[PDB]
């Protein structure tokens, strides 16, 4: 009857170990006030964006496109130095991807209107790597763990870049205490 992650708190209702990464961790009662499907879809989206974002924050320092506008090792400098029409194109393309991938059901009243729509299941499997039944739960656990780790890592990387004015790897190689 007690939460496994937080043993001095009672087990949150609507958390019953069914979803991947469920360790009964909801001390603030978000799942008692909001639906778990929207929360899982949001968690997967924040985590996937942070997976791409942490991988970018490490890789863009080491590898660049040719040109002066793509030569910033620090990612917050690359936000400003990159061509503006390209980044606006990125914004518009992300908007179109969000529009079509959710099949015109984008909001808190119409996404999951179809009963077949599963949280975080946009239908995305380009190489069909999910063709294995007993692999599925371990795959979803690995995806959500990578997403949570990526959220914490990218949050830290951005704010440490703000503190140090250094790209992450070269901050680790040229470290200066505050």
Ligand X SMILES: CC1=C(C#C/C(C)=C/C=C/C(C)=C/C=C/C=C(C)/C=C/C=C(\C)C#CC2=C(C)C[C@@H](O)CC2(C)C)C(C)(C)C[C@H](O)C1
Give the Å distances, CA to CA, from 14 to 36, 37, 70, 86, 160: 8, 11, 47, 43, 37
Q: Based on the shown chain and the rule CB under 8 A, indicate whether residue 177 belongs to the binding site for other proteins.
A: yes
The token pair that represents 32 in the structure block: 């008692």
CA gap 105, 108 in Å, rounded: 9
Residue 107 binds which entry of other proteins, ligand CLA, ligand X, none, CB below 5-8 Å type-dependent: other proteins
Q: Based on the shown chain and the rule CB under 6 A, indicate whether residue 49 belongs to the binding site for ligand CLA.
A: yes
Provide the minimum distance between the beta carbon of 168 and other proteins in the complex, in angstroms, as a whole number.
Answer: 9
Nearest to 102 by CA among 38, 26, 147, 164: 38
Q: Based on the shown chain and the rule CB under 6 A, indicate whether residue 65 belongs to the binding site for ligand CLA.
A: yes
CA gap 50, 148 in Å, rounded: 8
One residue of 91, 106, 137, 163 binding other proteins per CB under 8 A: 106
Residues in contact with ligand CLA by the rule CB under 6 A: 49, 52-53, 55-56, 59-60, 63-65, 70, 72, 78-79, 82, 86, 97, 101, 122, 124
């Amino acid at each position: 009857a007690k939460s496994k992650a937080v043993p001095f708190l009672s087990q949150p209702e609507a958390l019953d170990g069914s979803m991947a990464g469920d360790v009964g961790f909801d001390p603030f009662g978000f799942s008692s006030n909001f639906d778990l499907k929207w929360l899982r879809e949001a968690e997967l989206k924040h985590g996937r964006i942070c997976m791409l974002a942490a991988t970018g924050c490490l890789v863009q320092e080491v590898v660049h496109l040719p040109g002066e506008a793509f030569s910033q090792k620090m990612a917050l400098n690359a936000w400003a130095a990159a061509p503006r029409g390209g980044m606006i194109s990125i914004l518009v393309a992300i908007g179109l991807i969000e529009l079509i991938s959710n099949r015109f059901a984008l909001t808190a009243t119409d996404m999951f209107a179809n009963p077949n729509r599963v949280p975080g299941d946009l239908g995305f499997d380009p190489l069909s790597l999910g063709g294995n039944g007993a692999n599925r739960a371990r795959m979803e656990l690995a995806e959500i763990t990578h997403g949570r780790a990526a959220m914490m890592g990218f949050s830290g990387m951005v704010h440490q870049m703000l503190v140090s004015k250094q790209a992450p790897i070269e901050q680790l190689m040229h470290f200066k205490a505050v």
